[PDB]
């Protein structure tokens, strides 16, 4: 039914969905999941599909691997995940390259690996 409910989107939710489809690979997507809010009216013949908009913050994480801070856009729950499994270094090492659906996470991942390898 989901392929139907995407086609039943109100124009603000549809424009927000197009922007989500454009700028997904620009921000960190650790455990982030987009969601539709379809509300069910009991006096029937009305199913209004919308979007549950994610919340975004520009947190400045300190990398304990290489001596700098990086700024990068995240959600609350992926910040929970990163700061509750060990930090940016442990996340960028132990989450390999495909659960990262993100470009700056991949770039800082390569910089952590290269700087750490030259640090050996």
């Amino acid at each position: 039914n989901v392929r139907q409910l995407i086609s039943r989107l109100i124009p603000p939710a549809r424009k927000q969905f197009e922007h989500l489809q454009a700028h997904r690979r620009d921000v960190v997507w650790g455990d982030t999941q987009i969601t539709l809010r379809v509300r069910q009216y009991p006096k029937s013949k009305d199913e209004r599909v919308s979007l549950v908009l994610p919340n975004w913050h520009r947190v400045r994480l300190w990398s304990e691997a290489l001596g700098r801070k990086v700024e990068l856009v995240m959600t609350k729950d992926t910040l929970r995940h990163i700061e509750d499994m060990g930090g940016l270094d442990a996340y960028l090492i132990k989450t390999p390259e495909s659960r990262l659906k993100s470009n700056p996470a991949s770039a800082v991942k390569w910089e952590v690996m290269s700087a750490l390898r030259r640090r050996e």
């Binding site: 987009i34 539709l36 509300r39 069910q40 009991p42 009305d46 495909s98 659960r99």
Partner: peptide, 25 residues
Amino acid sequence: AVNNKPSLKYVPVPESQHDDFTSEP
């Protein structure tokens, strides 16, 4: 007059699991 307050439901929009790599490197 009648009451028509809706019941909310959240559908997880399946989100293909592991990855693909057809995008920009």
